[PDB]
A paper describes a structure:
Three-dimensional (3D) classification of the cryo-EM filament segments from the individual with the largest dataset revealed alternative conformations of the N-terminal region R272–G295 and of the turn G335–Q343 linking the fourth and fifth layers. Fewer than 5% of the filament segments contributed to classes with these alternative conformations, demonstrating that they were rare. No variation was observed at regions of zipper packing between β-strands. The alternative conformation of the N-terminal region, but not of the turn linking the fourth and fifth layers, was observed for the second individual, and no alternative conformations were observed for the third individual, consistent with the smaller sizes of their datasets. We determined the structures of filament segments containing the alternative conformations, with resolutions of up to 2.5 Å. In the alternative conformation of the N-terminal region, residues G281–G295 follow approximately the same path as residues R272–P280 in the main conformation, exposing R293 on the filament surface, and residues R272–P280 are in the fuzzy coat. Our mass spectrometry analysis also revealed that R293 was monomethylated in some [name] molecules. Methyl-R293 is incompatible with the main conformation of the filament fold, owing to steric clashes, and can only be accommodated in the alternative conformation of the N-terminal region, where its side chain is exposed. As this alternative conformation is rare, R293 can only be methylated in a minority of [name] molecules. Mapping of the filament segment locations in the micrographs revealed that [name] molecules with different local structural variations could coexist in individual filaments.
Numbering used by the authors:
A (entry chain A), B (entry chain B), C (entry chain U), D (entry chain C), E (entry chain D): 281 to 360
The structure:
């Protein structure tokens, strides 16, 4: 019942793996995630823009504006 | 019943693997995810734009504008 | 009953694998996912634009505009 | 009953594998997914544009515009 | 009964494999999926545009415009 509720996860002998119950939100743009593993190796590189939105009885006569990244330089070295 | 509710995951002896129950949201644009594994190896590279939206009794006479990434330079090294 | 509800996943001795119950949302544009595995190896490269939308009694006299990524340079190294 | 509801998956001794119950949403544009496997090997490369939409008693006198990626350069190395 | 409902999958001793119940949505444009397998090997390459739409008592005096990817360069290396 009600409005906009979200239940719990991983309880009462929890188990499994994943991503769940996201409303109006953003996940990424250069990110690594590792749990319960042996000798993981991960590389990520991103040039990105992300925009998101959720509205109930709302988001009315409104506005959301974004200009992306422009004109940058970046250097990351080695890992031996 | 009600409006916009989301149930829980991985409970009461949870198990399995995945992605579930996303409303108006974004997942990606350069990302790695690894759990419960042996010797994983992962590479990701992205040049991207993502835009998303969910509205009930809402999102009315509104606006959502995005200009993507322009004119960048990026270098990532080796992993030995 | 009600409006826009989503049930839970992986409960009460959960099992299986996949992607389910997505409304107005985006998944991809350079992404790897690996669980419960032995010696996985994954490579991904993307140049992309994604745009998405869900509306009930809504999304009315509205607008959604996107310009993609333009004019970038990117280099990712080796993994030995 | 009601409007726009989605039932749960993988419960009460769950099993199987796949993709289900997607409304107005996008999945792909450079992506790998691997669960419960031995020695998987995966390669993906994409140059893409994806656009999607779902509307009930809605999506009225509205607009959705996309310009794709233009003029980029990208290099990803080896995995030995 | 009602409008636009979708039932659950993989429950109560679930089994099988596939893709089901998609409304107005897109799946592909460079993507691999592998579960419950031994020594899988997969390669995918795409240059693509996808556009999709579902409307009930809706999608009225509206518009949906897409320009595809133009003028890009991309190189992905070996996997030994």
């Amino acid at each position: 019942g009600g409005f906009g509720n979200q239940g719990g996860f991983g309880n009462s002998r929890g188990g499994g793996a994943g991503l769940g119950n996201n409303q109006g939100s953003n996940m990424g743009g250069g990110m690594n995630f590792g749990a319960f593993s042996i000798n993981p190796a991960m590389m990520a590189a991103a040039q990105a823009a992300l925009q998101s939105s959720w509205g109930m009885m709302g988001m009315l006569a409104s506005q959301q504006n974004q200009s992306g990244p422009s004109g940058n330089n970046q250097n990351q070295g080695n890992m031996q």
